[PDB]
Amino acid sequence: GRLRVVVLGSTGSIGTQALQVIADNPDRFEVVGLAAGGAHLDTLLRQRAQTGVTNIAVADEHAAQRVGDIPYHGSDAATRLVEQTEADVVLNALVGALGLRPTLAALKTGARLALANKESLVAGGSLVLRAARPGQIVPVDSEHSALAQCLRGGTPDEVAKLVLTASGGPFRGWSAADLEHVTPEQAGATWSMGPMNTLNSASLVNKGLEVIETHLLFGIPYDRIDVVVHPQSIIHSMVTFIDGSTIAQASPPDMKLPISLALGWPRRVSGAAAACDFHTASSWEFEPLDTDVFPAVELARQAGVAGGCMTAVYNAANEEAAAAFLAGRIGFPAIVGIIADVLHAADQWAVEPATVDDVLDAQRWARERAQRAVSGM
Amino acid sequence: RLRVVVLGSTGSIGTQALQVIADNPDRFEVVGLAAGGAHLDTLLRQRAQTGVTNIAVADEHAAQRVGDIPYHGSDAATRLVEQTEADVVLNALVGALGLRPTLAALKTGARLALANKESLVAGGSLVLRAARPGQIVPVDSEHSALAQCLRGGTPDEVAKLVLTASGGPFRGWSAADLEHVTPEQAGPMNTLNSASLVNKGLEVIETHLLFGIPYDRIDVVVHPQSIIHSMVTFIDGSTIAQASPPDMKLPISLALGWPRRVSGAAAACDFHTASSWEFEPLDTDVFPAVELARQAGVAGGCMTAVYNAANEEAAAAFLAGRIGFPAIVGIIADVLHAADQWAVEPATVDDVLDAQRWARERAQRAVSGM
Numbered sequence: 001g002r003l004r005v006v007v008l009g010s011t012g013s014i015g016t017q018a019l020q021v022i023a024d025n026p027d028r029f030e031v032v033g034l035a036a037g038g039a040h041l042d043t044l045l046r047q048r049a050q051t052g053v054t055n056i057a058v059a060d061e062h063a064a065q066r067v068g069d070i071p072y073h074g075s076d077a078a079t080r081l082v083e084q085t086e087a088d089v090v091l092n093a094l095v096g097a098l099g100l101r102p103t104l105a106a107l108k109t110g111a112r113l114a115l116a117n118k119e120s121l122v123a124g125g126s127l128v129l130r131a132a133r134p135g136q137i138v139p140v141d142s143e144h145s146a147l148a149q150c151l152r153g154g155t156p157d158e159v160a161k162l163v164l165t166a167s168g169g170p171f172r173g174w175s176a177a178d179l180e181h182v183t184p185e186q187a188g189a190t191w192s193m194g195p196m197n198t199l200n201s202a203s204l205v206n207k208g209l210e211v212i213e214t215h216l217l218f219g220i221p222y223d224r225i226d227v228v229v230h231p232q233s234i235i236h237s238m239v240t241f242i243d244g245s246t247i248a249q250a251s252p253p254d255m256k257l258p259i260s261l262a263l264g265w266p267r268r269v270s271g272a273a274a275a276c277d278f279h280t281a282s283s284w285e286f287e288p289l290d291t292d293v294f295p296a297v298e299l300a301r302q303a304g305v306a307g308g309c310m311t312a313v314y315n316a317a318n319e320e321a322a323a324a325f326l327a328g329r330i331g332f333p334a335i336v337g338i339i340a341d342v343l344h345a346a347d348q349w350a351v352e353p354a355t356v357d358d359v360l361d362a363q364r365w366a367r368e369r370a371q372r373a374v375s376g377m
Numbered sequence: 378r379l380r381v382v383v384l385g386s387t388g389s390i391g392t393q394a395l396q397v398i399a400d401n402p403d404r405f406e407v408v409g410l411a412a413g414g415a416h417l418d419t420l421l422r423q424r425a426q427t428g429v430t431n432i433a434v435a436d437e438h439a440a441q442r443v444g445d446i447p448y449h450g451s452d453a454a455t456r457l458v459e460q461t462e463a464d465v466v467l468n469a470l471v472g473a474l475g476l477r478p479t480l481a482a483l484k485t486g487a488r489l490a491l492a493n494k495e496s497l498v499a500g501g502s503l504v505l506r507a508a509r510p511g512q513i514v515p516v517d518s519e520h521s522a523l524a525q526c527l528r529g530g531t532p533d534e535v536a537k538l539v540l541t542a543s544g545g546p547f548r549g550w551s552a553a554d555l556e557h558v559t560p561e562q563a564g565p566m567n568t569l570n571s572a573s574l575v576n577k578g579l580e581v582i583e584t585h586l587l588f589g590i591p592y593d594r595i596d597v598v599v600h601p602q603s604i605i606h607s608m609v610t611f612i613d614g615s616t617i618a619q620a621s622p623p624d625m626k627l628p629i630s631l632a633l634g635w636p637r638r639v640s641g642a643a644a645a646c647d648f649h650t651a652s653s654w655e656f657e658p659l660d661t662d663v664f665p666a667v668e669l670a671r672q673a674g675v676a677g678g679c680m681t682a683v684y685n686a687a688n689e690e691a692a693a694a695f696l697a698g699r700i701g702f703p704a705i706v707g708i709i710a711d712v713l714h715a716a717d718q719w720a721v722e723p724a725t726v727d728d729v730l731d732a733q734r735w736a737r738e739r740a741q742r743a744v745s746g747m
């Protein structure tokens with residue numbers, strides 16, 4: 001039947017692709033809510049106009065000043081819209097830890113949560129797990145989407161390993177010597193998924209973050225979650241079972257596919273994306289990740305094994321470190337060095353967070369600690 | 378603990394199956410062995426190891442040499458099946474001779490772990506009529522892969538099944554080059570059939586019979602590494618694939634243990650070292666055997682038995698130095714072209730035998746004229 005969808009982060013990259021999917025499938029989906037931050041207010045108003053959804057929220061009260069007929073506005077608007085709207089699916093495509101609370105509200109309503117917001121799991125960790133029930137969270141990320149598909153290839157008891165694929169970033173195969181002179185422009189650093197995104201995939205912190213999320217979503221121990229470099233990005237991830245069989249998910253890159261699947265779970269959406277084409281020659285290459293040169297994934301596994309607020313620390317330390325590198329203050333290899341520095345001092349943050357404020361507090365501590373590492377103070 | 382009868386126990390599949398069984402006594406027990414009689418040493422050894430005396434030997438003289446074989450003669454494997462209480466029949470015979478033991482296995486209500494693809498291709502709707510849904514679990518890698526990948530969705534979400542083909546030893550060769558191929562370069566039936574691409578054609582038919590999807594939604598792609606064993610493409614554009622280093626113990630173990638996987642059955646893909654999985658279209662003009670299989674499959678009825686039986690005769694002639702390599706598929710085409718009578722649905726096993734008899738003679742006739 002028709003699923004009722006609240007789209008949080010409607011004006012972002014994931015949120016707009018989801019509305020594409022939804023417009024293309026009015027049989028299967030209906031938008032009943034939209035929420036945005038306020039920075040792209042004009043897009044939200046166009047979206048109100050073109051979908052006819054008046055049930056909309058704007059996080060920034062100051063930006064909400066420009067409109068006058070928003071039923072939900074201010075710091076807790078997305079949360080309140082989630083609380084007050086009857087829905088079957090909440091797509092959380094918000095950016096930053098501000099996505100955490102709307103995630104919790106979504107879980108509490110009993111609606112299915114299509115999760116795009118990284119920090120919900122990476123920072124919110126045990127808060128989100130305590131609040132989620134099985135099958136409630138469906139991941140939007142292509143790796144995690146792939147994993148959920150491949151897991152249909154056996155029972156949980158039959159899983160030997162989860163293998164995430166990684167593009168390798170622009171410095172795939174580079175020596176550590178080469179990495180010493182990397183500049184922001186070489187590493188990426190765009191009108192959409194640009195800024196922080198390209199930097200995390202150049203540094204493989206993005207993979208580290210994905211490894212944590214994989215553990216939290218799927219329950220597989222960190223020592224059985226692998227990463228392989230796969231430059232074409234056709235195989236998005238795979239699962240090795242205990243008999244030696246590997247099941248893999250494959251498609252030409254297009255976020256509309258995992259997005260469509262997150263929305264319609266467990267039923268697939270006819271024509272969401274183009275299939276692989278075996279009418280023409282091609283190849284899928286794999287190479288191991290050099291973990292001496294890129295220890296960002298192993299760092300994440302250490303933070304993840306520590307647990308509690310530690311992955312909040314890991315991510316926050318990264319965000320500060322990358323900023324220092326983007327600002328010319330530090331060298332590229334120093335990004336993961338500062339992250340490790342902060343993690344080594346953070347033993348107090350192994351406790352389980354009780355509240356959102358605990359997560360935010362972990363985050364502030366990591367930033368300050370990383371800031372001191374950058375400045376030598 | 379599953380009671381398993383192993384037909385063709387001395388062969389490549391059979392010995393590997395016994396090893397898997399040997400390695401999991403908690404799950405599997407051999408209760409029967411069938412063999413041709415060409416490898417008595419291997420057979421005696423398996424008897425001593427498994428302690429099974431419930432044994433079928435096809436060759437009368439061979440069975441005589443061994444002594445105390447309860448089933449001997451041409452129908453011995455079939456009689457062993459009919460009389461042995463079993464949960465699983467592993468049919469790892471080679472050739473369309475596997476047809477009767479396959480039908481017998483199905484009638485006993487046991488699971489048919491099928492390595493002998495020929496019996497299904499020949500039997501067609503006859504074998505299907507005899508089977509319960511899911512009674513036939515494939516041992517063939519492609520089909521074992523497809524079965525796993527189909528867990529990726531419900532049937533109405535399936536867009537396409539994609540079989541992988543190694544391309545054989547003569548992948549990339551021209552028709553002209555193929556004229557010179559010797560039996561040594563195509564080196565048993567498996568090996569030759571992989572080279573001629575007839576094996577892929579049989580697998581395309583097996584795909585339609587096992588999974589019930591139309592021939593125009595079954596694709597073939599050449600993948601020379603043979604790591605990806607087959608894939609399913611769903612209507613949303615997602616493809617689910619199965620992959621493992623080539624080792625028949627994996628699909629054997631799964632066919633035996635279905636729906637449960639057997640830990641340690643085989644080595645997994647190793648991503649601690651670099652590799653490349655390549656794909657290219659099949660050169661169908663140089664290798665038309667897969668297209669000939671589809672034409673046979675779409676005609677249906679006893680036509681697929683004809684396709685296989687023609688090949689068996691032609692392959693024998695090639696291996697004997699009587700014809701050239703390209704003449705294998707040429708003869709199949711010639712025999713198929715004359716096989717108008719055989720589009721009828723087989724109603725008994727005799728219908729299938731009749732079609733095969735005709736096709737064999739017709740293939741000898743074509744060998745005569747060249």
Ligand SMILES: NC(=O)C1=CN([C@@H]2O[C@H](COP(=O)(O)OP(=O)(O)OC[C@H]3O[C@@H](n4cnc5c(N)ncnc54)[C@H](OP(=O)(O)O)[C@@H]3O)[C@@H](O)[C@H]2O)C=CC1
Pocket residue numbers: 384385386387388389390391411412413414415416417435451454468469470471472474492493494495516517518565567625
């Ligand atoms: N890796 C592989 O080998 C693969 C095999 N397959 C399929 O599995 C099936 C078995 O192939 P494979 O194991 O390679 O073949 P083999 O030639 O290695 O084995 C054939 C077996 O059948 C026995 N046999 C038993 N009864 C008879 C009889 N009445 N007449 C003739 N032979 C008899 C032979 O015994 P004996 O030798 O003692 O006479 C032998 O054990 C084939 O249909 C093949 O297509 C499919 C995929 C991969």
Ligand SMILES: O=[P-]([O-])[O-]
Pocket residue numbers: 165166167168169201206207
């Ligand atoms: O590095 P990419 O796979 O996120």
Ligand SMILES: O=[P-]([O-])[O-]
Pocket residue numbers: 541542543544545570571572574576577
């Ligand atoms: O060579 P095989 O894939 O038929």
Ligand SMILES: [Mn+2]
Pocket residue numbers: 141142143210
């Ligand atoms: Mn990703």
Ligand SMILES: [Mn+2]
Pocket residue numbers: 517518519580
């Ligand atoms: Mn095969």
